[PDB]
Design a protein around this ligand. Structure first.
Ligand SMILES: *[C@@H]1O[C@H](CO)[C@@H](O)[C@H](O)[C@H]1NC(C)=O
Lengths: 223, 94
């Protein structure tokens, strides 16, 4: 998270932290709980072996609120395109259901292709880098504004406003960054977006996957 | 006995917001071929790009950033290093 602040601890109890095995090394993403047995995240966070941590604030400490659960299945969208980062959405079925409590519980999803105003105020959170030189141990968050599509259309040759959201005012140094992939974009306490990609500099706008475009796939996959 | 070296990948101007690392052994002298095989490995895993795609692309390179603040840019279309000097790696394909 660039330009944000540390979250109040456990104020976002749907947040998931993902540790991913990726030859030849490791990857870290965010994600969010959408049902006691399912985490939603980005398809490019896929790996043969994924550990999920719920209930975390300081992910470098083994906190007494954390629940550690492996992913049983990691279900990418069937039309995920790695090269263009299109249809970038994945469901993790957890190997057991979370213990639901105040610090661990799911976030609501929107209704069938519910829209989102350019100018809507949304919040993104995660454990990603805060700059090109510094990271964070604790959950951070920042408020961002949905952009007109034209802003992403002219810099991202594969941005598709039917499936993706253009987020972030280019005049502000506020952005999700490396490590925040898969985390939710929350607007009015509903997860409308999934952090997906941007420029390597972290300068906005950046592209989120539009959750409402995939609701029928989400519901079929979770049943 | 190993370290994680962060890497970033940009393809056609887009970069996933993942935090991704390469595993290296501590304090080892490796060559640039050693790094390239790891770069091509994560390029294929993350963005589906292998050698054929680099030859069809316009320009392709990776940059090794070093802790002393220097960098070395290496062409993917056309010395030894100690792993503990490496700060990060960036890959760019057009
Ligand atoms: C997940 O945790 C198990 C047990 O702690 C460990 O053996 C495994 O390597 C972990 N996987 C990843 C991808 O970190």
């Amino acid at each position: 998270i660039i330009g944000g602040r540390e979250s109040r601890p456990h104020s976002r109890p749907y947040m998931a932290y993902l540790q991913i095995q990726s030859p030849a090394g490791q990857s870290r993403c965010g994600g969010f709980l959408v049902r006691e047995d399912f985490v939603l995240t980005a398809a490019h966070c896929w790996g043969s072996n994924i550990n999920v941590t719920l209930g975390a604030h300081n992910i470098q400490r083994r906190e007494n609120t954390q629940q550690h659960i492996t992913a049983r299945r990691a279900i990418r969208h069937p039309q995920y395109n790695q090269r263009t980062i299109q249809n970038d959405i994945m469901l993790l079925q957890l190997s057991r259901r979370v213990r639901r409590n105040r610090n661990v519980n799911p976030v609501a999803l929107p209704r069938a292709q519910e829209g989102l105003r350019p100018g809507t105020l949304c919040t993104v959170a995660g454990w990603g880098r805060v700059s090109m030189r510094r990271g964070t141990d604790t959950l951070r968050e920042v408020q961002l504004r949905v952009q007109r599509d034209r802003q992403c259309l002219r810099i991202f040759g594969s941005y598709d406003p039917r499936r993706q959201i253009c987020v972030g005012d280019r005049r502000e140094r506020k952005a999700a960054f490396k490590g925040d992939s898969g985390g939710p974009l929350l607007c009015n306490n509903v997860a409308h977006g999934i952090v997906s990609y941007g420029k390597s500099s972290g300068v906005p706008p950046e592209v989120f996957t539009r959750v409402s475009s995939f609701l029928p796939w989400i519901r079929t996959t979770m049943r | 006995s190993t370290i994680q070296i962060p890497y970033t990948i940009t393809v056609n101007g887009t970069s996933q917001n993942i935090l991704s690392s390469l595993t290296f052994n501590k304090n080892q002298n490796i060559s640039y071929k050693d790094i390239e095989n790891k770069v091509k490995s994560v390029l294929y895993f993350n963005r589906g790009i292998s050698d054929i795609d680099l030859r069809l692309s316009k320009q392709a390179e990776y940059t090794v950033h070093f802790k002393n603040g220097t960098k070395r840019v290496i062409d993917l279309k056309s010395d030894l290093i100690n792993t503990s000097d490496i700060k990060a790696i960036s890959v760019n394909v057009d």
